[PDB]
Structure formats: C-alpha cells, structure tokens
Amino acid sequence: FRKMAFPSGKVEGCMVQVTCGTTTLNGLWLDDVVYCPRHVICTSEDMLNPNYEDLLIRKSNHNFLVQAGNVQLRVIGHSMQNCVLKLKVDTANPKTPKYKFVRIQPGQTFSVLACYNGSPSGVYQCAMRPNFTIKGSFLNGSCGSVGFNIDYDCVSFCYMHHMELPTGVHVGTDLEGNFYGPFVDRQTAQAAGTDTTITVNVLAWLYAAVINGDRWFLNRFTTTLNDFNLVAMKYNYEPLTQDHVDILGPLSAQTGIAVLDMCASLKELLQNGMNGRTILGSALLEDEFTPFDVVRQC
Amino acid sequence: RKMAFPSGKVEGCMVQVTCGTTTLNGLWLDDVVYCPRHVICTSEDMLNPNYEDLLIRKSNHNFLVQAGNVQLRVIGHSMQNCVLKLKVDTANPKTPKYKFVRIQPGQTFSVLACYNGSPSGVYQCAMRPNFTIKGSFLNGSCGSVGFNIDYDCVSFCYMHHMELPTGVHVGTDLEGNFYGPFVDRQTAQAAGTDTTITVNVLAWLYAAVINGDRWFLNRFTTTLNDFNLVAMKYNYEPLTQDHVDILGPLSAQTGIAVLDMCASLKELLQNGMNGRTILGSALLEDEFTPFDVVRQC
Ligand SMILES: CNC(=O)[C@H]1C[C@H](n2c(-c3cncc4ccccc34)nc3cccc(C(=O)N[C@@H](C)c4ccc5ccccc5c4)c32)C1
C-alpha cells in the first residue's frame, strides 16, 4: 500500500508558461485554449480590491506571452470565466488528451502535477479537505498547476492552483473558474475553517489494511449509525451518511466485515490509539484514500 | 509530500510481453524490449531453472510483444544477466534520453506500476538497507520499472521481479543484476533484518524546520562517534562523514549544523515524540534523501 498518483504523461504535454508583465505562472493548454488563474493580470498592488473586468479590458492579446517548451504561442483572443482566464491561441495542442472538467466534492482525491515555468517537477496524491483546502506542496511559481484523475484513459481535470493561505494550505478552483470553498482571489483576511477528518476514507483504509492481512484492530462490537456519528464528531470526524455506508459496500463484501462493525472498530481505535502498532506503515489514521482508491489499488 | 518524478517519458516505453501462458511488462527502448528472464519459465521450471537451456528451446515467435494495440515482431533474443533482451523490428519513436544506473541502498526512485503493458500508477520508493523495496505490486506487475530523472535524462534503476513472503519486493537493475541476495528461482527466500536510513531521517528533519516545525530543536550538540553509538542501539544506519557533507546544503539553507540536528534525533530516539508530530507524521520518516528535500523545497 502506497499513495499512488496517476501517470502524469497525458497532463505533462498540456503544461505551458504564461507571462503577463512581471508575473509568470503555469497554464493548461487544451485544443486552442490556454487556461490559467485570472490573477496573472494583477500586480499585487492590485490584489487588495482588484476589479478584474477593469484590469482585463486594458490588456491586449500581445500583453500575454505563452510559451510551450521552446516555442511561442500566439494569443488571438481572451476571455474571463469566473476566476479563470481563457487565452485563445493560434495553435491547438497536438498532445491534447481525451479530457473533461469535473467539480469534485470534499473527500475526493486526485493527483497534482506540480509545475514551475511550464515544466513539471513532481506528481503526488491529495484530497479535497472538508474545509475545501488541499494539503499540497507548492512553492512560488506553481500557480496554474492542476489536479486530475485518469480513470479509463479519460483525464478529468478537477483543480487549478491559485493561492497558499497563511496556515500553509492551498486553495484553488475547478476548471470552470469556481473556487472550492468560500475563498476569493483577493488579498483578504480569509482563513480555512476548522478541518475535520474524512471518516469514510479512514474506513476505506482500514478495509485496505484487512485486505493486506491485518485484523488486530477489529472487535466484537457493533454500533448504530447515529451512535457512531455522535462519537465520531467528538473527535472532529466528519459525519458518516448512508451514502457513505452504501459506497463502502463492495469493500465490506470482499472482507466479510459489515460497515457498522468497521465503524465499531474505528470508535475503539479513536478511544485507544494504536498501542505502539502501525497500520499500513502509518502511526496515525489515514484519511486521504477513498473507497474507489482502495479498489483501484488493491 | 512524497513526490514522484513526472512519468511521461517512461509511460511511452511500457509494452506487454507474453510467453506461453505468462504475461508481464517490458521496457521498449529503441529496438530492444527488456523484461524479467523468468517470463520464459513455467511453474515447474522454477524449481531448478537452467535459463540458458530453457532459452535455447524458445524461438522468436514464442514471444508476443504488444505496444498498445500494435504488435511488435521479435527478431532476436538474448539474456544479459537476469534480464531478457528481445530485439524487435521497430525502434520506439518515443525513446527518451536515458541511462541504466545502479542505485545504492538508501537512495529513492519513482515506480511506474504497470499491468498488461499499461501504466496504472506512480509512487516514490526507497531501496531499503536490506535491498528490498516496500512497494505495492499485484499479480501481473513484473517488469514494472523504477527511475529517476535529471534535466531530460531518465536514469532507469529498477525492474520488478518478485514479492517476498513478508510482502516486500525485490528486483534487478536494468543490466539484470539483482539488488540483494536474491535469485529468480523457487526456493526459500526472506527479507533480512532492516535498518533505518539515518541520513534520510536527518534530511526530513531539515525539511520539517524549513516548513516551520521546530519543537525538536535544542541547545545541545554531539559528535559523530557519540551519535553512532546511539544509532547502533536503535537499529539506525551509521552516519558517516560523507553523509554529513551530503547534508551540507540543508545545513546552510536552514543554518543548522548536522551535528546539531543529530542531537535532536538522539533525543527523539531516546524519549520519543511525546504525542507530537513532525510534518504530519507520528513516525520518523526515512524515505526522503537530502537531494529529495532540496528538489521539493
Ligand atoms: C497570497 N497569495 C497567494 O497565496 C498566491 C499568489 C502566490 N503565487 C504562487 C504560489 C503558489 N503556491 C504556493 C506559494 C507559496 C509561497 C509563495 C507563492 C506561492 N506562485 C505564483 C506565481 C505567480 C504569481 C503569484 C503571486 O504572488 N501573485 C500576486 C500578484 C498575488 C498577490 C497576492 C494575492 C492574494 C490573493 C490571491 C492572489 C494573489 C496574487 C504566485 C499564491
């Protein structure tokens, strides 16, 4: 068991560099459109109360320098969609994969291709936190890097990176430019809400531990769904819904362990800790593997 | 984060190789496909295989190689060590700049896990001091490769051959030399006792201070010999002078001397973490090299 990302090649051939004035960041080149954060047009002095419509009307196509590897792309038009800028270019990307845009829910996971100056540096896995932030690894220059899944040769783009908050977590938009969570591309006092643990993912990971041969944390108890939730919330765990229970069904069938019986085991693990032991290499309960991820990998 | 190299340059080299009823993955570079030589073996062959004799009984047509939906005609075969080299009639147009390198225990690399010639996922792994890797691999993953990248050049370092009883994984370099005292034969084999990669734990503590985790720093310093005494005691690898120099940059970037950090690790080893965490971990992480920290940070 490992945090497995998707193979990044299909996304690597879409990464470009976008420069506007003194600002350079990453863009996503699909067909004849380059997508990037609309704050590329801002000078940081603009960031307290930016009027993006007023800022954008003053720009010409040639104010945007887009470079794909060694070749310059010619911008022939531009438009704003929510908080994403769409730069129409003269050339369509011949490496455009089969793709779609998907807005994900808190708890969903995806791979991130971290990029600087249009060139990929690394790939890793992470999750939409319940507070709509992601715990990424991003440095100055990484704005415009994207997150994606690739189930069955279709790239589903779900995240574009915009900002790092004071607590060091990361926020961005879907590829239609709508922010995840209550955040805005503006220098305001916005702070992440208190984060909670993604309960349905912890349960999926415990099922993965059972598949790989550990049973030490099981017990003879069960629980009602409401009693579990009353307990779980006292540990800042997210409520478990009947939807989550249904989604865990396949893992329950494979292991012979009823979902509410695994909930009874999680209750005891939160009460007892791990007693010097580890589960799948970890001394903490892991919440960034979804039920789908466990089935994919195991 | 545990960060892998972008895998695009390698994805274009993965193919499917079938021999008899056995299917696994191959690496297609120019006009040669590389794969584990045990592809030629049946279950009964593995009890005592004579690979030279088993290979002389195969012909080119016994090897079915498929690059996606396109069949590649094998025109020759040979063994190097434990790697089979299938010469094919078409050079891979997607061959990257590459080298075959052999890595040392403690070094890390990315694994592109592959089934039926099709890349499934990518993750970061380290070569343990006992020469195993703690990967995740299912039936069909043999022939998946490990690699590093430096400025356009892919350094291939690992090809997957086997899984041991404890669930860890063993393989060869791309010249077919096994990592560790392992053989591609059906016989009793087991992972040896493993140790913690000290220089990597120190690199990860430096990454922690770069990210604002400082609670484990203290006023104390130590010497190489004092520290290696406690390292021995806790099943850590000895720290050498080369390790201290390899941590040189991080020591300046952070302005914290290596022997100053060692005094922190000493205290973490002796008294534990006291309910606290470092970079989101309740354990001391040893699968990040000093280079890995520099590259990511
Ligand atoms: C408070 N900023 C933010 O967290 C945003 C802006 C930061 N950044 C990053 C970046 C992306 N990941 C993590 C980072 C960590 C440290 C420093 C920078 C980053 N890579 C960048 C590449 C180009 C430009 C910027 C940048 O700095 N742009 C300027 C005009 C700016 C200033 C204030 C902003 C406030 C709110 C929203 C957008 C704002 C934008 C970039 C991210």
Ligand SMILES: CNC(=O)[C@H]1C[C@H](n2c(-c3cncc4ccccc34)nc3cccc(C(=O)N[C@@H](C)c4ccc5ccccc5c4)c32)C1
């Ligand atoms: C002692 N096996 C091993 O650790 C590996 C060899 C196995 N495997 C894998 C594979 C690779 N990762 C993890 C696995 C976990 C469970 C099952 C299979 C795997 N994917 C395979 C794809 C094709 C063939 C085999 C296979 O099984 N081949 C047969 C001829 C075989 C039999 C005995 C062997 C003994 C020693 C070495 C190689 C041996 C090889 C494959 C198991």
